[PDB]
Design an enzyme around this catalytic site. Structure first.
Site, PDB file in Angstrom:
ATOM      1  N   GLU A  78       0.843  -1.215   0.000  1.00 50.49           N
ATOM      2  CA  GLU A  78       0.000   0.000   0.000  1.00 50.49           C
ATOM      3  C   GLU A  78       0.874   1.259   0.000  1.00 50.49           C
ATOM      4  O   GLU A  78       0.680   2.180  -0.801  1.00 50.49           O
ATOM      5  CB  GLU A  78      -0.889   0.028   1.254  1.00 50.49           C
ATOM      6  N   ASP A  82       1.213   3.745  -3.297  1.00 55.75           N
ATOM      7  CA  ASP A  82       0.774   5.137  -3.160  1.00 55.75           C
ATOM      8  C   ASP A  82       1.831   6.119  -3.643  1.00 55.75           C
ATOM      9  O   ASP A  82       1.545   7.038  -4.404  1.00 55.75           O
ATOM     10  CB  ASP A  82       0.428   5.454  -1.692  1.00 55.75           C
ATOM     11  N   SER A 278      -7.266   1.637  -3.844  1.00 53.34           N
ATOM     12  CA  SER A 278      -6.054   2.201  -3.229  1.00 53.34           C
ATOM     13  C   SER A 278      -5.159   2.966  -4.236  1.00 53.34           C
ATOM     14  O   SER A 278      -4.469   3.910  -3.871  1.00 53.34           O
ATOM     15  CB  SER A 278      -5.189   1.081  -2.635  1.00 53.34           C
ATOM     16  N   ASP A 316     -18.088   8.588 -19.036  1.00 49.02           N
ATOM     17  CA  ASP A 316     -19.176   7.916 -18.330  1.00 49.02           C
ATOM     18  C   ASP A 316     -19.031   6.393 -18.353  1.00 49.02           C
ATOM     19  O   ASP A 316     -18.914   5.816 -19.436  1.00 49.02           O
ATOM     20  CB  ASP A 316     -20.507   8.312 -19.004  1.00 49.02           C
ATOM     21  N   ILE A 317     -18.990   5.747 -17.180  1.00 54.89           N
ATOM     22  CA  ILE A 317     -18.923   4.282 -17.157  1.00 54.89           C
ATOM     23  C   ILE A 317     -20.387   3.896 -17.029  1.00 54.89           C
ATOM     24  O   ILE A 317     -21.080   4.392 -16.156  1.00 54.89           O
ATOM     25  CB  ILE A 317     -18.142   3.713 -15.951  1.00 54.89           C
ATOM     26  N   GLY A 334     -24.692   3.008 -14.760  1.00 53.58           N
ATOM     27  CA  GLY A 334     -25.654   3.393 -15.781  1.00 53.58           C
ATOM     28  C   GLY A 334     -25.303   4.764 -16.322  1.00 53.58           C
ATOM     29  O   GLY A 334     -24.252   5.302 -16.007  1.00 53.58           O
ATOM     30  N   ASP A 338     -23.484   7.211 -10.955  1.00 57.78           N
ATOM     31  CA  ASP A 338     -24.039   5.964 -10.426  1.00 57.78           C
ATOM     32  C   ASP A 338     -23.249   5.594  -9.178  1.00 57.78           C
ATOM     33  O   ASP A 338     -22.142   6.118  -8.952  1.00 57.78           O
ATOM     34  CB  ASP A 338     -24.037   4.822 -11.455  1.00 57.78           C
TER      35      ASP A 338
HETATM   36 CA   LIG Z   1     -22.278   6.235 -15.151  1.00 59.87          CA
END
Ligand SMILES: [Ca+2]
Length: 357
Positions: A78, A82, A278, A316-317, A334, A338
């Site tokens: 981690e 980072d 992360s 946009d996913i 969507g 979202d």
């Molecule tokens: Ca979306």
């Protein structure tokens, strides 16, 4: 299908990070509750990518210090992820790593220490640690939330990973849970996607969901924090939990997190691949660093502004869900905001243009 990996520069290119900016003049604070980093891995890594190594310094909070355990699969993973992701993308920035005990007070004190640090004066704080918001003592959630509010008032951006255990956030009480600190409305909550991209375009970006065994992005509706005024146009749904209360929607934005399309990094001398939300906080911390450099003043709290920007600033996913507990597909991605990916992945140069005076 076949797992792949990217160097941080490849993902930054896919998200069109603004060119000619490296974070010079900015200090990124990174919070750590365990492990440490070794100069050998960092040196090898930055040299491998052709970037000049940023200055990295450790800060001791409540007696805790930089102490690698030597296990590439432990917390050193981690800590080094980072620094390597944020540093490879904002190599001109100064990186201050704050180590604190892994306790409620240690986490809080690391935040307050970093936010008010007159020596390092970070303009950005990146967090990749957390827990179910309902699993934290109420007093700690309130204290940490006020510390993030304080950061906002001071012009310091705070980004935090949304979680790697889907919509249930690792709890098995049959209810959905969002993670804290990402649930804080003063934090830029960072979710995760599976990204298929090349230097010139993104071929596909979907919700990161590799099932119970591979992890999935955190995301959902807070049961603690009311829906913020600036988020009322995002169409956040009511909670999927019985009672369907209204609440702050998580995450705000999202980026590559799937280990199956993960980040190539060097941890404790070992070249390997790591993913998880992360990686997303450090990734966008570097983006903000570049933006702050160009603007000549820190953007600070970004949430309200991001939610009023035009659609061109984000990718946009719309496909996938972050359910790794059952078949209900809670929650689902969507069009538009979202509870899996928020506003989506930022298109760097467009976000910068949108912020230029
Ligand atoms: Ca979306």
């Amino acid at each position: 299908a076949a797992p792949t990996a990217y160097t941080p520069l490849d993902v930054a290119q896919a998200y069109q990070f603004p060119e000619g900016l490296d974070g010079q003049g900015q200090c990124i604070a990174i919070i750590e509750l365990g492990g440490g980093y070794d100069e050998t891995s960092l040196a090898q890594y930055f040299a491998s990518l052709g970037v000049s190594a940023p200055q990295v310094v450790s800060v001791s909070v409540d007696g805790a210090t930089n102490q690698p355990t030597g296990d590439p699969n432990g917390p050193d993973g981690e800590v080094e992820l980072d620094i390597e992701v944020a540093g490879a993308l904002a190599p001109g920035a100064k990186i201050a790593v704050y180590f604190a005990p892994n306790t409620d007070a240690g986490f809080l004190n690391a935040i307050t220490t970093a936010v008010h640090d007159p020596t390092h004066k970070p303009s950005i704080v990146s967090i990749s640690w957390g827990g179910p918001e309902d699993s934290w003592a109420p007093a700690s959630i309130a204290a940490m939330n006020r510390a993030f509010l304080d950061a906002a008032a001071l012009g310091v951006t705070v980004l935090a990973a949304a979680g790697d255990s889907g919509s249930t956030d690792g709890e098995q009480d049959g209810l959905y849970h969002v993670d804290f600190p990402a649930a804080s409305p003063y934090v830029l909550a960072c979710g995760g996607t599976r990204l298929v991209a090349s230097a010139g375009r993104i071929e596909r970006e979907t919700v990161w969901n590799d099932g119970p065994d591979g992890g999935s992005t955190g995301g959902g509706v807070s049961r603690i924090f009311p829906l913020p005024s600036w988020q009322e146009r995002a169409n956040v749904p009511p909670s999927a939990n019985p009672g369907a209360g209204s609440g702050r929607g998580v995450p705000d934005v999202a980026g590559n997190a799937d280990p199956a399309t993960g980040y190539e990094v060097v941890i404790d001398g070992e070249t390997t691949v790591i993913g998880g939300t992360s990686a997303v906080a450090p990734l966008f911390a570097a983006l903000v660093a570049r933006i702050n450099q160009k603007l000549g003043k820190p953007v600070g709290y970004l949430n309200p502004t991001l939610y009023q920007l035009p659609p061109e600033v984000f990718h946009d996913i719309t496909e996938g869900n972050n359910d790794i507990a059952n078949r209900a597909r809670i929650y689902q991605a969507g069009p538009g905001w979202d509870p899996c990916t928020g506003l989506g992945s930022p298109i760097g140069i467009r976000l910068l243009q949108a912020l230029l005076p």
